[PDB]
Symmetry: C2
Subunit: 114 residues, 2 copies
């Protein structure tokens, strides 16, 4: 199979997710220093969340570019903090989820005989 | 919180790889059992707006052999991708931020 395609697409998904986690973080920071801007950023994201992180940020920059810049910085820091954990967590997570899926289906199968 | 973040990130990745594994099995079925390939494509088109684990539970109710197959495939996809991610994510987020900043210098 095309591992390069899947690795790239996986990476794009990851960056989009961390972008949105960065948006949540800045919302929280604005709570400590400037509460009206927290609500604005939350509301903007409700109609603007349904898109790739890069398209969301371009939308944000048109309206509040100080916030767009803070998010670039936070998302880079979040990525630096999590990146090296991801391989083992993914492998362990998929092993655990697979076990649970199999055990549940087997329990279903033997329950349909009881 | 870094710990909550790396966990939630992981959940998101597992969901994504689950749906990638679905496409793999659709492709395999396109060879061995075209009507079931179509069936699985159609099911997935209606059941994908949920976490991968809930998708699998639903699939297991209908076509359990396909659920079992997707579990094995997603494990393989994880193994094929996982060790690229620390580099791809760092390099990717650096280039994406460079692009954003170059754009907004306009």
């Amino acid at each position: 199979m095309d591992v390069k395609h899947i690795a790239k697409q996986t990476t794009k998904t990851l960056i989009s997710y961390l972008t949105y986690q960065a948006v949540r973080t800045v919302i929280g920071q604005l709570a400590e220093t400037d509460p009206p801007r927290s609500l604005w950023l939350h509301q903007f994201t409700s109609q603007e969340s349904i898109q790739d992180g890069e398209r969301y940020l371009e939308a944000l920059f048109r309206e509040q570019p100080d916030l767009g810049f803070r998010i670039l910085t936070v998302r880079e820091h979040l990525a630096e903090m999590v990146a090296d954990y991801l391989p083992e967590m993914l492998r362990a997570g998929i092993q655990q989820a697979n076990l649970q899926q199999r055990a549940q289906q087997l329990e279903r199968m033997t329950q349909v005989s009881e």
